[PDB]
Design a protein around this ligand. Structure first.
Ligand code: MG
Ligand code: ZN
Length: 339
């Protein structure tokens, strides 16, 4: 199996050795990238298909279940159906059994795959705060008060996990900001509509360039949201670590807020549910307030969301939604083409 096995082991290794999100973003063995390349190889040489399948299955089946979670989204992705058809059910049983075991030790269990009403029976107060985005806006902590946090979710919607996150938020009257990506929106428009219907803010996150190529990436995610909903909030998040002064100026000209964050979840890193809750809550406490970075495409984030929300409440934190001061801004984005 050596090249496929080497790449599988490399994904796991790089995920553990990365010190930051940006470093992990720099990996050459990101599972999404690995499977995009395998789909291409599979397409272009039919003589290699059966051996790719047997090898991929053997190498993924060799992983400990917790490590296998790194590849879960690729295994679930119907685009990869032919690659994993030989072992999909078995792999997903291993991952599902892992999250079953993880759930046992939680006082407020969640479930990313099915609709569960958690044990949460509290309600965060409404707390929506307006920001003038007409000549842009740079958010790090978002100008919120002590013990206020803004929950933000990148790269969705996912076909399953986002709805679990929505259920968790709704149960406790929490609102959030979603920075959707074009690819996810095109795959899952009905899920995006459910996010919209639950009162959340929805902007975009680009994913990869010359200035014009980068600007086109900024427009494209915004356009995808707009094409589904008839609006897109004037909020945008760069590809992590982007420093371009030109793109920052562009956003201001285009009356769109630029959202960074100050509270890391590290939810990109394979880890136990326990570890993830500990890291994100330690960072909430360390910072005291601000903007939290989650990914609604990360299963484990959906699994821990009810528990996370209960701990925010227990710890005296309140959830804030940031939104444009101009309620019409979402219908008149300078990043989208009408009609
Ligand atoms: Mg505004
Ligand atoms: Zn992202």
């Amino acid at each position: 199996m050596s090249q496929i096995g080497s790449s599988v082991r490399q994904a796991v290794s790089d995920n553990q050795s990365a010190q930051t999100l940006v470093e992990w973003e720099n990996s050459e063995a990101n599972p999404e990238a690995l499977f995009a390349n395998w789909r291409h190889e599979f397409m272009v040489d039919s003589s290699k298909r059966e051996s790719m399948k047997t090898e991929l299955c053997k190498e993924l089946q060799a992983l400990p279940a917790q490590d296998l979670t790194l590849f879960e989204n690729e295994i679930r992705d119907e685009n990869n159906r032919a690659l994993v058809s030989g072992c999909k059910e078995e792999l997903l049983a291993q991952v599902d059994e892992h999250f079953d075991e993880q759930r046992e030790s939680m006082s407020v269990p969640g479930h990313a795959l099915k609709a569960v009403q958690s044990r949460n029976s509290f309600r965060f107060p409404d707390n929506t705060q307006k920001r003038d985005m007409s000549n842009g806006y740079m958010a790090v902590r978002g100008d919120v008060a002590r013990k206020e946090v803004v929950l933000t979710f990148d790269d969705g919607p996912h076909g399953l996990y986002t709805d679990a996150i929505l259920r968790a938020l709704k149960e406790v009257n929490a609102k959030a900001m979603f920075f959707a990506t074009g690819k996810s929106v095109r795959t899952n428009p009905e899920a995006l509509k459910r996010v919209a219907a639950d009162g959340h803010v929805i902007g975009s996150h680009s994913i990869t360039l010359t200035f014009d190529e980068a600007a086109a990436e900024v427009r494209g995610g915004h356009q995808a949201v707009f094409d589904v909903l008839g609006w897109v909030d004037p909020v945008f998040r760069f590809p992590y670590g982007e420093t371009s002064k030109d793109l920052k100026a562009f956003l201001k000209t285009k009356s769109t807020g630029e959202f960074a964050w100050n509270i890391e979840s590290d939810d990109w890193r394979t880890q136990s549910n326990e570890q993830l809750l500990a890291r994100v809550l330690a960072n909430v406490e360390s910072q005291g307030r601000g903007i939290v970075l989650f990914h609604d495409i990360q299963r484990r984030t959906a699994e821990i969301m009810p528990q996370f929300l209960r701990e925010l409440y227990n710890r005296g934190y309140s959830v804030v939604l940031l939104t444009a001061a101009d309620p019409s801004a979402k219908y008149n984005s300078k990043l989208v083409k009408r009609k």
